[PDB]
């Protein structure tokens, strides 16, 4: 039992995985076994979702999070997001589940049977955390892998049947992307957009050409970065800025994953392009807009002149102006005027919502969609009672958008905490005081008093 108690390792059982820091073979096993757990869940969860799936109800009425990801890639769906074939969902689930066995086998082998350190076995596979060149090499390999993955998305969208396009002319449908956006002014433009209202940084991406083009760039950037990191060693200024240890590296990645988690939370909460509402349900903004649309339609059918109808406050009951003058829906949904969606855009003119289009061009499909979205707003209880907090039991619904945003907030948050924990510890360990202050060399005792 090498390094598998507190007396030999210096780490208690509850920090037992820290016993692995310098045991590259066993740590490889932990990592590969873990990847197995991730892949297992993707596989198992998909098959559970498929088993539980009723094709003629919306996905979002059924507690699905994975089938919607598969559908968004253009698999299993047709016009409007209707399910035309569940077999692609079965395939994805099965292949992930099978693959997990392989990862679990490798993981278990390296963890309990293989060489506990890799360095005397292989100069290629072994590593010292403190060897800057080998760390950038392995980083480089993994960048190449990630770039190939981004190009897989590109290949799916351009060469293997397309992606689900909620914006497709004449109604959402799977569409092949033939003209991905390559112009770096557009692609990198998203990156410099404000994250505030009406701008929304990268989360505002609203067409598949930009999405695909973005992955072309990312894939090429990542492959190039990987080659770069294989072929170079960190420069002097980077050597002086960072802590070079396994725990430090963990810390940096925790920081990064935290940031990505908060971004993902915002993506699924606001974005209805890469998270089509057909699969994920309406966004919060979308459903609030849909309510105003619903009652505008109803009251106008009854004879209301909706442009001229003054509400209790003096603002338009149905229609008002945004702070820059655009015609928008009124009531509290004034906050959501930056919302855009395919059911609403046909009513939009150069100056915003167009009164003549409103009076004459609203189609029954738009009424249906607005009613659907108003009544599947992402509000609901922890026990999955759909609606406002005061609603009675009846409807079993919590939007996938709420599940995905809340879970990823929680996870991003604790990952920030882990970043702080491990970055602070990495620092202290590198400097030599992570176990406490030396009684005979207490630094404050050598400093002048403050007063």
């Amino acid at each position: 039992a090498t390094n598998r108690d507190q007396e030999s390792s210096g780490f208690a059982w509850w920090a037992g995985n820290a016993r692995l820091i310098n045991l590259s073979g066993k740590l490889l096993g932990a990592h590969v076994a873990h990847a197995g757990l991730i892949v297992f869940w993707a596989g198992a969860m998909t098959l559970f979702e498929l088993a539980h799936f009723i094709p003629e109800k919306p996905m979002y009425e059924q507690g699905l999070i994975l089938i919607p990801h598969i559908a968004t890639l253009g698999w299993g769906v047709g016009p409007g997001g209707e399910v035309v074939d569940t077999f692609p969902f079965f395939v994805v689930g099965v292949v992930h589940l099978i693959s997990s066995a392989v990862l679990g086998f490798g993981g278990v082998y390296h963890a309990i049977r293989g060489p506990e350190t890799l360095e005397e076995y292989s100069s290629f596979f072994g590593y010292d955390w403190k060897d800057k060149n080998k760390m950038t090499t392995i980083l480089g390999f993994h960048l190449i892998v990630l770039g190939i993955g981004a190009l897989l998305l590109v290949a799916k969208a351009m060469f293997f049947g397309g992606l689900y396009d909620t914006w497709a002319p004449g109604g959402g449908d799977v569409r092949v992307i033939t003209n991905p956006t390559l112009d770096p002014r557009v692609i990198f433009g998203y990156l410099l957009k404000s994250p505030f209202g009406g701008e929304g940084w990268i989360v505002s991406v609203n067409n598949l050409e930009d999405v695909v083009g973005g992955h072309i760039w990312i894939g090429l950037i990542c492959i190039a970065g990987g080659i770069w990191h294989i072929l170079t060693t960190p420069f002097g200024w980077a050597r002086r800025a960072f802590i070079w240890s396994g725990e430090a590296y963990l810390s940096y990645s925790l920081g990064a994953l935290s940031m990505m988690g908060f971004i993902a939370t915002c993506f699924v909460w606001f974005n209805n392009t890469v998270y089509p509402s057909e699969f994920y349900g309406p966004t919060g903004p979308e459903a609030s807009q849909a309510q105003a649309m619903t009652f505008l339609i109803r009251d106008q059918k009854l004879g209301a002149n909706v442009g001229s109808a003054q509400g209790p406050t003096g603002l338009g009951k149905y229609l008002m102006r945004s702070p820059t003058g655009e015609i928008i829906f009124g009531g509290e949904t004034m906050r959501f005027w930056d919302f855009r969606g395919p059911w609403l855009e046909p009513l939009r003119g150069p100056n915003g919502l167009d009164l003549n289009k409103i009076k004459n061009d609203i189609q029954p499909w738009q009424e249906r969609r607005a009613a659907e979205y108003m009544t599947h707003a992402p509000l609901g209880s922890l026990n999955s009672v759909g609606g406002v907090a005061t609603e009675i039991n009846s409807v079993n619904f919590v939007s996938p958008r709420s599940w995905l945003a809340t879970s990823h907030f929680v996870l991003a948050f604790f990952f920030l905490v882990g970043h702080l924990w491990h970055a602070g510890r990495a620092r202290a360990a590198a400097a030599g005081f992570e176990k406490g202050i030396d009684r005979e060399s207490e630094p404050v005792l050598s400093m002048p008093s403050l007063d």
Partner: protein
């Protein structure tokens, strides 16, 4: 040494009465801006159209508030999540009507308080301490993020951010209860266990150490003089304190390890408050408290109320009265 070197040495100096540091370089200006704006606004700001319905709410002392009713009022619902710096207004009069001070204050504050957390790491490093005080501070900090940034993001407006004021705070609480049934949410329940338990353990620790202070003084002086700053010897008898507490309950329910005790004292409130913060941050995306409305039904199908249904009636009161001129349509969807 050159100027930059000298400057860096001063910024990171362990000898400044108040530590500056690199975090402090951002913290100091942002906190001062937030503070100065808050003070001036709390005193002298005119009414603010919080709900975007041209119904301005007076928050300042000079416009008829006392300390309890006063506030800096959230930015207008018309603005939503848009960024409203001074320079996006046609004039300061407009900026004021629309609740511009709120955004300036909360953004400078959240940046500054984040740097306060970083600064706690930074000084711990300069002094050769262990690094995790900042992690305990992440709990109140996360909570401030939840009420000033995350909740607005989820609901689509800074108008739904917690107001900067005492009564404003209560308004935020009552409306949150109406809209999310927070009392019935297990993360707020963990938060309560966190602060009631933090208070309990605070009193308990204080009382047990105070119980066991070693006699070093006479009856006509404060026992506090029995401890001298920086003495090597512990000032209470932990063996006696454990002897006491272990009999109060039973032996193995009491800590005889000071490190383990002090870790528990940190962890209990911090973890509970992290769940409080996560409660607010997840109700931000309308995953709400448990809903047992009409969960109990008799053999015929008559509803048999429980205490959940009574809560529901209170919540309804809040819901139907809040922002009484702002809703035109039947459902409050954000």
């Amino acid at each position: 040494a050159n100027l930059w070197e000298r400057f860096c040495n001063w910024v990171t100096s362990t000898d400044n009465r108040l530590y500056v540091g690199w975090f402090g370089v951002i913290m100091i200006p942002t906190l001062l801006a937030a503070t100065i704006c808050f003070v001036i606004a709390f005193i002298a700001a005119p009414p603010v159209d919080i709900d975007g319905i041209r119904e301005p709410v007076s928050g300042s002392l000079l416009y008829g508030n006392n300390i309890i009713t006063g506030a800096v009022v959230p930015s207008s619902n018309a603005i939503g999540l848009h960024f409203y710096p001074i320079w996006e207004a046609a004039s300061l009069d407009e900026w004021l009507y629309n609740g511009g001070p709120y955004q300036l204050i909360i953004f400078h504050f959240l940046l500054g308080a984040s740097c306060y957390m970083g600064r706690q790491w930074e000084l711990s490093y300069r002094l050769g301490m262990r690094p995790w005080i900042c992690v305990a501070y992440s709990a109140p900090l996360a909570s401030a993020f939840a009420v000033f940034l995350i909740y607005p993001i989820g609901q689509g407006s800074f108008s739904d951010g917690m107001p900067l004021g005492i009564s404003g705070t209560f308004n935020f609480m009552i409306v949150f209860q109406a809209e999310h049934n927070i009392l019935m949410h297990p993360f707020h329940q963990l938060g309560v266990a966190g602060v009631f338990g933090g208070a309990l353990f605070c009193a308990m620790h204080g009382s047990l150490v105070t119980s066991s202070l070693i006699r070093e003084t006479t009856e006509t002086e404060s026992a506090n003089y029995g401890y001298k700053f920086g003495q090597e010897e512990e000032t209470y008898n932990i063996v006696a304190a454990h002897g006491y507490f272990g009999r109060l309950i039973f032996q193995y329910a009491s800590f005889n390890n000071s490190r383990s005790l002090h870790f528990f004292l940190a962890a209990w409130p911090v973890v509970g408050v992290w769940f409080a913060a996560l409660g607010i941050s997840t109700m931000a995306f309308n995953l709400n408290g448990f809903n047992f409305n009409h969960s109990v039904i008799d053999a015929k199908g008559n509803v048999i109320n429980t205490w959940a249904d009574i809560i529901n009636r209170a919540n309804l009161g809040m819901e139907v009265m809040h922002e009484r001129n702002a809703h035109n349509f039947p459902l409050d969807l954000a």
